[PDB]
Amino acid sequence: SHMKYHVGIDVGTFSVGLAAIEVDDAGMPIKTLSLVSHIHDSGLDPDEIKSAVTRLASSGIARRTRRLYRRKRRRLQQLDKFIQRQGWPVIELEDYSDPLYPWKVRAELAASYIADEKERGEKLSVALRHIARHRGWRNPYAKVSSLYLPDGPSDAFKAIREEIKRASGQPVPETATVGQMVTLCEKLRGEGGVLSARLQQSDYAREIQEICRMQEIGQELYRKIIDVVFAAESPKGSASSRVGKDPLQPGKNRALKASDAFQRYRIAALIGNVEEKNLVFDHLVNLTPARPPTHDTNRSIVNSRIAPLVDWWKTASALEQHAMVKALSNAEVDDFDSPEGAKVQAFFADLDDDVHAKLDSLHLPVGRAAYSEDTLVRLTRRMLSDGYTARLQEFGIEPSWTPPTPRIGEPVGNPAVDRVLKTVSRWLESATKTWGAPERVIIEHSVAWMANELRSRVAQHFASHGTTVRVYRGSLTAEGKLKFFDGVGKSRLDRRHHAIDAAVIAFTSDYVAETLAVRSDAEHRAAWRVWCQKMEKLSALLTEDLRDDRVVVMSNVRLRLGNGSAHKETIGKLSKVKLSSQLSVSDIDKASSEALWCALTREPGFDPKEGLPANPERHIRVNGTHVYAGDNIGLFPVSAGSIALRGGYAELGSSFHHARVYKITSGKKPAFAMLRVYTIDLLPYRNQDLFSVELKPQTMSMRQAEKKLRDALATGNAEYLGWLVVDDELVVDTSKIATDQVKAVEAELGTIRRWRVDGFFSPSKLRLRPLQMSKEGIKKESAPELSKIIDRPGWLPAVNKLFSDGNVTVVRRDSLGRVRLESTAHLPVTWKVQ
RNA sequence: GGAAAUUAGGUGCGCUUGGCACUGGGGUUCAGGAAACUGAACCUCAGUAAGCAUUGGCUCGUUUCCAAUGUUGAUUGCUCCGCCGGUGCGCCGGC
DNA sequence: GGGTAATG
DNA sequence: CATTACCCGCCAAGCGCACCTAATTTCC
Ligand SMILES: [Zn+2]
């Protein structure tokens, strides 16, 4: 389009004010193109009760924990295979009748020799498998070899040792293993017994060591046992995948600190910051001996006084010892592929058991450089042959060069920031592809990192079209006569003020920018006269849009199947009932599986009202498994939707993906019901349209549904009209269906016809809140009805009452806030409930 | 304003571990009982999202079974389908 | 904050 | 139908990648 306009962007803590106003050729506002107060969830996990935990954070904890249980099972499987290769038997502890049998064996093995070769191996296998389960803690980067010569007893070991001395009275504070202290007590696990059990793997390795001495087990096998019992993956190269990149040379990973490159680079940087001959002379001394810098890694390596290491350092080539640096640093992956690293790795086998612990005491510098190894070396070479100035000539980079920025929507790692970045990119792209590029983009308001990154990302994005981009401080930003919901001029309750503040921001001249912050030069005064002429012209446009309610308050919706944890974490005991018992319809709907529900509901004696009568001769098949009248079956003890899990059960919670809306034509009068679809009932149909997935009556979603809707679906009197999702926008006529507290809100604040879907409260009730309002605007002098409707729990209308007499329309919008009535791309579309 | 090296500090995540809690199997010892039995402490093993993918099986399941291995399973808010746009069939983005 | 279970 | 009480699993460890803030020397 040939229209010229300005763009104002207001960044809030949980909102984004987006504004674009058509501007005259001189600078006067003409028409408002798009006013949007975009609200976001800050990327937070809804199931974390507002402890400021994002989905990314909780996903990672679940991801790592899920792997932890897998890694723990692999260890115990490998230990059993290691025990069987030694001719020892893998005996289960439930075979022995003594519940404390593993503790007795661990104390017996650490005291005297065991005669029988069979009994000695059977009890060693019992003691080893037990220590592996509760094996204490070690530094994750410390390798197994750090335990071949275990360290002295930990502070926790000494603390527990004195604890038994007090409770038992008879102490042995000398050469006592963990097993033989505990054995004489005859409540360990928990807060009370092991006093939080802040133990160490070295303490358990010491117990294993003494067991090996008593059973005539040399170091050749003790070491091999320590390898298996204390096996663990290392977090060595865990950070190697998320390393930044060189701006000058994109494809190369950033240089690693404590490398011969960076160290020889670093001191070259300081001398340059003249004597164009004596540069290299000074550098020679600085290389090989605020304070001056040095080749810190080489100094740290030699001083270590590790006799076997120092011999390798001089004999190894510069490239060979470069691999030694990567292997010792906690940020690099050991390779075993190149010959160099294979030599370093081969050296890592022959060292004595006393050498290993000395390696962990050594500390190399940690960090990353801005450029990359090849660029690090190349500039020192060019630095040597010269006296920034040294850096310029290497790349043919025009001196004004700054490292480029990614696309606007490129995520940065912070979930709250990535919400804004992706939103601003989407809106500008929709704005650009409609009215072309803008003339000015002005951005306003820890969170300032967003605003800075926006300007940089936006400026490069619009560099071709010559668009000015500016940021301003929040205090300078704030420095009218508009009518909002709660007050005049200013408002914290009305969410439309975010777009209004963004509109004013699109018209802040830089000469006005000085005086605005100043108020909290002759030409500066000429600007103010032009400015007020624009502002007074702008004020009229927003009043109309505020009156016509053209300011759009909106948020995105989440339609994918995955949405946090799929059920509650607490597990409860199931209810077991003999099959011959009397089973009402309520009892059958509490069955722990769908197959059980089908077997019970397909019985001949089943009645849709009375259920199943007591019958000592009823026969039931569940997944080919026959169940007699004398067998127990599992039922949920609660009416809540749940799943059988880990022997017991767990409640599904608020894990609704979407809710479907039905019209029930029963002949009496058309009624409206609602089906809340659980996330779990859409798992087998992940690859389909979730809103068209045929849910079967056996699914929990169906059984938890309003009974009226269930009978209608079984007869064909329920018409699927559409689906709702959390953060969907509704238009509601509250004249006939508003509750008393809603009307009290509406009387004080005006009729509220735009509502937002915040939850699916009951199988028959919605959770709605006013779309354009925020809780922070509720003052102490306000009415208590506002806190009920806006804060908690909100308007909770019945689905049938709301849709029958509310004249409700579900409103979906595009990125510019415009109502979307039809879509070629099969995107969510506005529809009317009728 | 910005960039490099620095000293001080913060935020956000990444990786591997350590303890519990919960449910299930087992076991011992108690409390109360005349007993049958309850119930409580402990100890031990196991599960620790639901699932999805591959392989191989069964009684081959619209009551969707079993076993092994892997898992990015839960960031990226318009699922799926479709059309473009980048990217290393898939990922990201736009409608 | 969400929902369930339980009252008006 | 509307309204209200009450329910939700937690705590450590060492390290490293990213980014930001406040200062000093150069240089753009
Ligand atoms: Zn049968």
Q: What is the dihedral angle through the alpha carbons of A37, A42, A43, A45, rounded to the nearest 10 degrees? A: -120
Whether A50 sits with its Cβ under 7 A from any strand C atom: the answer reads yes
- For residue A790, give the DSSP letter: I
Please give the protein residue whose CA is closest to the C1' of the nucleotide B25. Answer: A94
Task: Give the separation between CA A437 and CA A32, rounded to whole angstroms.
Answer: 16
- Residue whose Cα is closest to the C1' of C4: A640
Residue (of A384, A367, A154) closest to A259 by Cα position: A367
Two structure tokens written together for A623? 């997944």
Query: A641-675: b or e for each residue (b if 16 or more CB lie within 10 Å)?
Result: bbbeeeebbbbbbbbbbbbbbbbbeeeeeebbbbb
Asked if strand B contacts A595 at the CB level, meaning under 7 A, the answer is: yes
Q: Give Cα A731 distance to the centre of its chain.
A: 33
Query: Which two structure tokens, joined as six digits, stand for A208?
Result: 């294993």
Distance, Å, A693 CA → B1 C1': 56
* Residue A701 Cα to ligand 1 middle (Å): 30
Domains of chain A: 5-46+406-554 (3.30.420.10), 95-229 (no CATH), 240-395 (no CATH), 726-832 (no CATH)
Distance (angstroms) between ligand 1 centre and the Cα of A822 equals 55
Please give the resolution of this entry in Å, rounded to 1 decimal. Answer: 2.9
Half-sphere exposure of A623 (CA within 13 A, CB side): 5
CA of A189 to C1' of B41 (A): 13
A797 touches strand C (CB under 7 A): no
Identify residue A269 by its one-letter amino acid code: A
Give the E-state strand segments of A406-467 in sequence order. Answer: 440-444
All residues with CB under 5 Å from ion ligand 1 = A 619, 626
Whole-number distance in Å between A388 CA and D24 C1': 18
The pair of structure tokens assigned to A340 is: 């160099």
Q: Would you say A833 and A672 are in contact if contact means Cβ atoms under 8 Å apart?
A: yes
Q: Is A524 annotated as a binding residue?
A: no
Separation of CA A619 and ligand 1 centre (Å): 6
* Contact between the CB of A244 and strand B at under 7 Å: no
Q: Pick from A500, A506, A505: which is nearest to A544 by CA?
A: A500
**Cα distance between the two ends of chain A:** 39
CA A535 to C1' B44 (Å) is 78
Q: Structure solved using which method?
A: X-ray
Contacts for A483 with CB less than 8 Å, ≥ 6 apart: A543, A546
SS (H, E, C) A99-159: CCHHHHHHHHHCCCCCCCHHHHHHHHHHHHHHHHHCCCECCCCCCHHHHCCCCCCCHHHHH
